[PDB]
Amino acid sequence: HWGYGKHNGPEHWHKDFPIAKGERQSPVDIDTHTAKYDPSLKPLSVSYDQATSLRILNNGHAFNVEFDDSQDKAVLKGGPLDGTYRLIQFHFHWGSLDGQGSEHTVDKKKYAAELHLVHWNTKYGDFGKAVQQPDGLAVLGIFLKVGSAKPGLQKVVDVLDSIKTKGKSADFTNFDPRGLLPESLDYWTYPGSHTTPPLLECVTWIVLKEPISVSSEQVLKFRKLNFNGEGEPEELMVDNWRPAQPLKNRQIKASF
Ligand SMILES: [Zn+2]
């Protein structure tokens, strides 16, 4: 099936998911000079004090931190959004080297990694139904640069050993997502899609301007993950990012 290799990479996805070359595909390049300042844009509201993490899993394309979304426990509202979005999971995209890894780019600049906090619109009742709506999801994107270590991230780094290969999972309770947020909530927003198959065009992108710094050692551990299942040839999980897609008329607005 699809992956990030030469034979099943992003350039091949269109064959199985024709929407690959749709009109509101993601990620894109954020041109800071063309992005439009919108004063009608409300401040983001991140309510994660009562978040409940459950576990972490290696799905063979990335690692996911799953949360209990049976109640309005960890929610996102305000900004360009209408209604309440519930956090379901978070994952990252990274590279083989520090000069690449982000999906979205700023003025063509690539970051070391990119964190995705995925949320679904409650009016649709479940994740599965939300992915069928134009306003079904809301993903908060955060860039990672290499500098100083991120204390909040270390809990996640230490558990990777446990989910080395495709299909493994481990209990992961009492993880507070708040340790991964930058100081500023200033952002860019545009309508787009998921960055992995089914690449459904149901996402309201919310990309934070201010990146979070992670240490060399922390990102190094990400790079030790495997795409492959256990007992199979070892394929390091690196460069699990999709290249920037055409804006195609769409407009990127700024909250600042
Ligand atoms: Zn993602």
Was 195 annotated as part of a binding site? yes
**Cis peptide bond prior to 27, omega within 30° of 0:** yes
Question: Which residue's structure tokens are 């899609």?
Answer: 193
Residues 9/197, Cβ–Cβ less than 8 Å: no
Among candidate residues 35, 13, 30, the one with its CA nearest the CA of residue 256: 35
What is the set of active-site residues? 61
Q: Quote the ligand 1 centre to 127 CA distance (angstroms).
A: 16
Domain that residue 249 falls in: 1-256
How far apart (Å, rounded) are the C-alpha atoms in residues 112 and 97? 7
Ligand 1 centroid to residue 36 C-alpha, Å: 25
Tell me the pairing of strands 137-146 and 113-121: antiparallel
Q: What is the resolution of this structure in A?
A: 2.0
Token duo for residue 188: 């860019």
Structure determination technique employed: X-ray
Alpha carbons 123 and 81: distance in angstroms, whole number:
12
Between the CA of 27 and the centroid of ligand 1 the distance, in Å, is 9
Closest to 103 (Cα-Cα) out of 213, 27, 11: 27
116 is in an annotated binding site: yes
Q: Residue 205 contacts by C-beta under 8 Å, 6 or more apart in sequence?
A: 26, 104, 139, 141, 188, 189, 190, 191, 192
196 has binding-site annotation: yes
Residue type, 143: F
Give the separation between CA 116 and CA 112, rounded to whole angstroms: 14
Write the single-letter amino acid at 124.
Answer: Y
Q: Write the CATH number for 153.
A: 3.10.200.10
Alpha helices in the chain (DSSP H): 127-130, 154-159, 216-222
CA distance 110 to 99: 7
Joined tokens for residue 214: 């992670």
Q: Number of structural domains, the chain? A: 1
Helix (H, G, I), strand (E, B) or coil at 163: helix
Q: How far apart are CA 146 and CA 217, in angstroms?
A: 9
